[PDB]
Ligand binder design. Structure first.
Ligand SMILES: *SCCNC(=O)CCNC(=O)[C@H](O)C(C)(C)COP(=O)(O)OP(=O)(O)OC[C@H]1O[C@@H](n2cnc3c(N)ncnc32)[C@H](O)[C@@H]1OP(=O)(O)O
Ligand SMILES: *SCCNC(=O)CCNC(=O)[C@H](O)C(C)(C)COP(=O)(O)OP(=O)(O)OC[C@H]1O[C@@H](n2cnc3c(N)ncnc32)[C@H](O)[C@@H]1OP(=O)(O)O
Ligand SMILES: *SCCNC(=O)CCNC(=O)[C@H](O)C(C)(C)COP(=O)(O)OP(=O)(O)OC[C@H]1O[C@@H](n2cnc3c(N)ncnc32)[C@H](O)[C@@H]1OP(=O)(O)O
Ligand SMILES: *SCCNC(=O)CCNC(=O)[C@H](O)C(C)(C)COP(=O)(O)OP(=O)(O)OC[C@H]1O[C@@H](n2cnc3c(N)ncnc32)[C@H](O)[C@@H]1OP(=O)(O)O
Ligand SMILES: [Cl-]
Ligand SMILES: [Cl-]
Ligand SMILES: [Cl-]
Ligand SMILES: [Cl-]
Ligand SMILES: [Cl-]
Lengths: 397, 397, 402, 403
């Protein structure tokens, strides 16, 4: 029979800007920061009993290569007996790590696990295919920071290779999400994040990154100075007849997060504090060219299976890849554009979105918000490049 | 409460040599080959019901970048509504995809899934770190084909960054596995593989790869003319006092594989043939410098939990990354060096080892051997770079 | 006080290989050294520590030809470390510039005995990557240096354009009204004449072979690889233009990209006597000219006019004209501007770069040495070699057989 | 055969010399080379520019934005007519001096009348290079830095002659010629002191045209050489660590640096001087080159100077200025000692040299010729010698006479 699974302690680094405060920190070292903090914060745990470290990471070409979960656990000082595995569902990878950890415990195969994710987009490398012939004249370098590389002509002909901003424009057009509404959403994100930062809400989630000594402690991507007037003046990324701008989109960023999941038996054995029970995770696919609407089938699949209406959640943490798609998703699910339970502390337009980290951040910040507000059920959901969505539901204990 | 999970149809490409028969085939296209074959071979399936495609891939920097599972299912012609996720546990990735798919169905979250793996080591790209400073003089290209890149000094100082063949020499030394015994094992691998090829055993597992037209239909890596005399003449990789040679080690290779897993209800609805029930998966960690011994703790953990003795398995598919470690593993588990149930059709010394594919191949070939021999329980297990092992048990229906 | 006479003595070249072909395995520096080693073997009366300078032409200099390939080559060839070397770059005219620069050094009395030559390994030309301009730059790019533009300056493009070499040849065909049919007929004559000269052993007299290692033993590369002796007018007419259906330049009426090296000794009269050399021609002079980049193939016209005006020699007075065949369109346009018939018997009598290939840095040295070889075989007196240059130049050099 | 023609250096100008990654690092090498050419146009309105016979430019690298004959790229960018030809010369650090002497030979032999000679290097912007694959799916691809020194090493070169770095050659010169760390540091200090004094006196300002640099709120100008360390003391030099390890003598403080800059000058026959209203400033007497073992390349000037002075029948002691390239204090001192000139002889580098000023490879030799002439003007001296070392074992020397 199935086992209940509890999220326990959870922690994250600050999120850095591209080329900013964390740009010097290798991805594997960055991933190790939250793992080391979990060790320090949870002295009752017998660490050689960790069954697995599951980490999300979208890139894996740079210093996050060759299974960054295992690299990170060894750099964190966890025993060499502890296994690790790295998951890739692009911007959803960190959420997938939590849900995969959940499934491993629920199915009785493990008792005590760490789930998290990482991305260093600053340090994403360039890649060069091998020569396909002697003295080939066709060598090319490609940036892996974000988006398409090594484009397959068959993918392009069948589905297109729209950039992520192009897809967000496509959602704005197809779902009729105005520029004005996008900018209003982006402003609320900045305003709510600024409030939460000043209130110390993010500080409770954050462990500092030491750079050897400089100490990085605050989320750097926020623009509390944002006004509607300033957003209105920005030019769309893809031309004047379009709507997505740098100001109504998330950024490219660096960060890591991690949390402990445990069975009821492991909670007691390790002296953990159970904070939420995981209820379930679901995934859904959509057309690549409207990848931002991906959350809608994921949320519907998960909520229909669990028998929970979207309106039953006390917090919804909806990834803000682009305001156009966040608004489109809310509208498809029948939730108001400014519904109080949605992103109450702001989201990725203010905070940034290091791909592999962001899904683990959404879960842990949803739990944090449930604790602050005394709410019960929380939903975290996010879109995925090339047309998917992922949704995960928790309940505060 | 937990749900039974069945492996149904399974298929793979042939395994190509580095720069050989499949070197022209992009990893995403190669992954799509077994997916398209599963469609052809399973006409009762309603394909928009597939809940997830899980695929193993160790590299993810090349044409396998950005979640090859999803790229591959789209290229295969599967509906865009089907989600996919890519797993990385180095050489164990494909086995992890199977076990992860299993946990998703056992826990009641899914009903019908595809699990598999891919690697194109021929086409693994070079990588180049970003400049850390304007006008940096420290740019560098690294090969991603196999092994360490972007070495972390903290990893080197504490754990070492031994190459995989160095770790195999370390295992040979620490576990006293002689050169003569390694060569005897390598010879049996080539003999058994040559016999299985001739009997049409691999042909039953293989779907051809069509290259624009050349049809690739046979495993390319086999050396059926191998003699003990020829292996004896070979020079060790790591110098004259070492024992691991190119003749007693797996190679660098290209290939892909995939299989269907389903709940009993999905078996019925989609007219599938249930072929084995998945019993469980376990992982284990060891010192990186002796990563070849990693299957030992994985196998022990799995069999202790299931209450199955290693001697109860009718087939053991033990990954042959190196003869030294295959022998060491067998000896620690109390199984003879030439036990008839171990790798009865040969293994990666003869067949090659595209990292992300190999673990999916071991599961499907274990099941295939059970059907041919009338055996009941099968074990597949393998080591993992940087010191892990993975083990998965199945039972023919 | 007076200038000194300057004599070309021995000259030798490698065969010309195709891109990725017979010489593709040979490093550009090693390749440059092959004709130098042959000059040493062929001229045993020379006191080698009296060579004043080695001048070598090389258009690329980013690969194994980097950091002054003249000096690398002379060291690799076994010449004494006391001999200086300098590398010249005027793109496809580099090797001719090395000869004329060597000539000027002796004529002005500053040197007595020199080697001039040129090299290119276009097979082995590397890729180049600019440095990052900022920390964590997302703007890194590789560019091929085999031929043509890289690191384009926006100011060059806006003022002069950055037409590819074949585009410039189509521009010459358009502006100077040179038909596809005439281009193809010229290319056919080049192939026919080169096939005839190869059969006659004419190229063999110029060539030192290059030894290459195979798995089972060694082979010798002895023959120019680029020739297409089977070429016919029908074969040329079927080819598609490089730049699209309304254009005229094809791979069959254009030079190729190729590998090779060449070198020759130049000496004052006193050095000829002292070192036991055989003087073969006197150098008369060299001139350079500029034109619009976008019609760079017409470059030889002002160069030839400048040289012949200064020397007081009519173009029709030359017994051989070696005119580089970068493209049939520009070869024809130059001949027409100069009042020479498209098929005049004294022009390219042994064929040219359409048949033979054109390793940039080597080609100008080959044109001088082959003009001299042709004068000797034919009993001619004066020879003119001239060639075009990317980004709009011409170079011309005149000699007179002794 | 007719008579040789006398050759005159006329106007000459240069950019400031920028540090690596410093004031001129944003400026492409081809645009940088165009800066002194545009200034020569502005400064000499008497000249009929379509009569320039050739632009000769030195450049050691030629793989970056200086590719494909930077002399021709630069003259077109400078606004000179497309009828003017150009050619680029490469003798590494001597390239710019080679341009001047090559221009001299072309006019002396009667082949030209009016020419520009100069040199450029942007070592900041020197690219990386990558050889082509020799085989399909090759696993052996490599990037190499072209900023300075060996790349694409030939095993035959290494076996026979070695592939010592330039600082390693300077250590080899210190060892074999017995040039002490103390003497090297004393030489380096004198270079900084003399350069500081010349800068303050406005001496470099007379040679310099400013370079304009893009900036977000309006372009800025670079007016001054950036490399100078006027506050250097003997104590600071004494404390530096050697480049090549603890027991050696060459340091960053007694070596030239890696730098950016360009320079150019006009050379003309007597007839061209008249026709174009130019001021003849010096006659070029001659140039000579010499080779030495690669491993002690810094001693290259010795055979070059001896060859030149023997032919011209001028003693080293007859020169009123000697501009000796300061690639390394160790080689500078060794050369002087071999030539019988005191380590601190007043006519040697009176305004300092490359240790203080820096050394963009292609530019340096053009700078040495123009600064030698400048110094002869200031001092009233007659004959000047400029000479320098060349990587892989060469030296180049060029002599001029004022008026
Ligand atoms: S799950 C998350 C998945 N990840 C993504 O999809 C990542 C999406 N983000 C991106 O790809 C980029 O961040 C995009 C949206 C393409 C924007 O990048 P660009 O390169 O086009 O633009 P910049 O980042 O250079 O920004 C352009 C200018 O906009 C200004 N700006 C940003 N935000 C604001 C606000 N709030 N107010 C005013 N201005 C704002 C930037 O400062 C920049 O100005 P400059 O003057 O050019 O520096
Ligand atoms: S889960 C699996 C994880 N992956 C690994 O750990 C992969 C380990 N493998 C490797 O990294 C390489 O395969 C190693 C072991 C380093 C060897 O690489 P090579 O590139 O040297 O491999 P080749 O196939 O080219 O073989 C080397 C030479 O040995 C000869 N040889 C091999 N096997 C035999 C047999 N059975 N009989 C005779 N000769 C044999 C090869 O032919 C080759 O000889 P050459 O003359 O060099 O062609
Ligand atoms: S001073 C020298 C300056 N140098 C230059 O400007 C160099 C100019 N040359 C080039 O850049 C290239 O050589 C151009 C003109 C761009 C063409 O390059 P390609 O790589 O296309 O050339 P190939 O010869 O490899 O291929 C062209 C195809 O045409 C066929 N072909 C050529 N010539 C003939 C003749 N005489 N007869 C029949 N066919 C011919 C080639 O065989 C080839 O056909 P494939 O079917 O592709 O083999
Ligand atoms: S014809 C000319 C041919 N060209 C050459 O041979 C060029 C040779 N030069 C080089 O390759 C480099 O310049 C070498 C000699 C290798 C040194 O390179 P660096 O990159 O180390 O140079 P820096 O300018 O960074 O100097 C290193 C440190 O030394 C300190 N330092 C130098 N000079 C002084 C003086 N005069 N006084 C005090 N300190 C000095 C630099 O400040 C620097 O200190 P950091 O704290 O590391 O910046
Ligand atoms: Cl991405
Ligand atoms: Cl992002
Ligand atoms: Cl071109
Ligand atoms: Cl250099
Ligand atoms: Cl200098």
């Amino acid at each position: 029979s199935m086992h209940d699974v509890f999220i326990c302690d959870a922690i994250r680094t600050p999120i850095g800007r591209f080329g900013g405060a964390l740009a010097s920190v290798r991805a594997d070292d960055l991933a190790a920061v939250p793992l080391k903090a979990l060790i320090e914060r949870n002295p009752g745990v017998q660490w050689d009993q960790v069954d697995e470290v599951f980490f999300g990471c979208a890139n894996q070409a740079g210093e996050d290569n060759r299974n960054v979960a295992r690299m990170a656990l060894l750099l964190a000082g966890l025993p060499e007996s502890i296994p690790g595995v790295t998951l890739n569902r692009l911007c959803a990878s960190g959420m997938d790590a939590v849900g995969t950890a959940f499934r491993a415990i629920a199915s009785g195969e493990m008792e005590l696990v760490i789930a998290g994710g990482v991305e260093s987009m600053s340090r994403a490398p360039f890649v060069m295919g091998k020569a396909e012939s002697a003295y080939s004249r066709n060598m090319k370098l490609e940036d892996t920071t974000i988006g398409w590389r090594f484009i397959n002509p068959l993918m392009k002909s069948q589905y297109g290779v729209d950039s992520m901003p192009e897809t967000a424009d496509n959602v704005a057009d197809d779902y009729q999400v105005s520029r004005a509404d996008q900018d209003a959403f982006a402003l609320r994100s900045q305003q709510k994040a600024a409030a939460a930062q000043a209130a110390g809400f993010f500080a409770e989630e954050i462990v500092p990154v030491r750079i050897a000594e400089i100490i990085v402690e605050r989320d750097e991507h926020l623009r509390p100075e944002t006004t509607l007037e300033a957003l209105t003046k920005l030019k769309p990324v893809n031309g004047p007849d379009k709507t997505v701008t740098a100001g109504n989109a998330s950024g490219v960023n660096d960060g890591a997060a991690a949390m402990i999941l445990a069975s009821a038996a492991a909670v007691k054995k390790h002296g953990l504090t159970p904070r939420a029970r995981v209820l379930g995770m679901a995934s859904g696919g959509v057309a690549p060219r409207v990848m931002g609407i991906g959350p809608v089938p994921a949320v519907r699949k998960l909520t229909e299976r669990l028998g929970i209406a979207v309106s039953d959640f006390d917090v919804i943490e909806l990834n803000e890849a682009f305001a156009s798609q966040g608004l489109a998703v809310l509208r498809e699910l029948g939730v108001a554009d400014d519904a109080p339970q949605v992103n109450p502390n702001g989201g990725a337009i203010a905070l940034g979105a290091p791909l592999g980290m962001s899904g683990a951040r959404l879960v842990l910040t949803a739990l944090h918000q449930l604790e602050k507000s005394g709410g019960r059920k929380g939903l975290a959901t996010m879109c995925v490049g090339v047309g998917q969505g992922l949704a995960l539901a928790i309940e505060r204990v």
